[PDB]
Amino acid sequence: KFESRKIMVPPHRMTPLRNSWTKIYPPLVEHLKLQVRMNLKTKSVELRTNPKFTTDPGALQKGADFIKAFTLGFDLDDSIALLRLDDLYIETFEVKDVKTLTGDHLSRAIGRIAGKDGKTKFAIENATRTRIVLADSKIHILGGFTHIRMARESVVSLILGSPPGKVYGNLRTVASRLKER
Amino acid sequence: EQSNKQHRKAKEKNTAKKKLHTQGHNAKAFAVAAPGKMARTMQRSSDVN
Ligand SMILES: [Mg+2]
Structure with missing residues (x-):
């Protein structure tokens, strides 16, 4: 039940990711029970569901949809609406x-x-x-x-x-x- | 409320130096040597007809 995603970040949305990261990792960790990690040595966000804490099976794809919609260009709050x-x-x-x-x-x-x-x-x-x-x-x-x-x-x-x-x-x-x- | 602007067309064959050739002949070549005399005598003899 340990599982992951990894989604890449194009460079024009890499400044606003490391510029708005502080509002992104919280509503991915507590509210969703999900274990973020952003790789820089391949410019990509990675997510993993850890088998202990998580309850909703759709959490992993919920988070992947959220980050990807931030990647394509939508601002933070709108992507949060995708998360909820x-x-x-x-x-x-x-x-x-x-x-x-x-x-x-x-x-x-x-x-x-x-x-x-x-x-x-x-x-x-x-x-x-x-x-x-x-x-x-x-x-x-x-x-x-x-x-x-x-x-x-x-x-x-x-x-x-x-x-x-x-x-x-x-x-x-x-x-x-x-x-x- | 979008109005485009008129493309002002470009004419076809109707130019005052090309109208002169559209009849049978070159009409520039059947002219006279004194248009003033042609006019005053033409008018008078019209009235005397
Ligand atoms: Mg013109």
Whole structure:
């Protein structure tokens, strides 16, 4: 029942890991009964469940999901939400997986997804209760399964060309028919 | 509320120095040597018809 994981850390998220480690190892050790160790000599977090203390078998994968969601780019508190609840998944896709774009066309596509001052991105998060990080081109979405399909459908309607005002309007309609349920 | 900007098109074959060749002939070549006299005599003889 002694078991482990080890998940790697890309370098742009290695400063914020060793910069926010103090809030990470506690709610992995007491609340979860789980034995962290971060290797630096291969740049990777490692976890192990120790057979004595632990109760929940899903603790190990709960922690691995938590650290990995911090790895892909989501801030600390959001990853904590992944640690607590039981209904949270991440879906990742690309920009070349919708429509093959390159050159300047791709930097303008990321400009429409992100909006000025982040506004358009935030709107998609706020009216869908999901959290989006938007990497180089790969786009990552965290939420519950139905919500992330709503936010995936808005993001993909933004890559293909539709302007952003249309997606605010359709977004608030989606918000109406979401909040009632 | 997104309006794109008009692409101002580029014309086809309708240019004032190409209109002059579209009829049967080169219309620049059937001209006169004194347009002022052509005008004043043309008008007068119109009135006298
Ligand atoms: Mg011009």
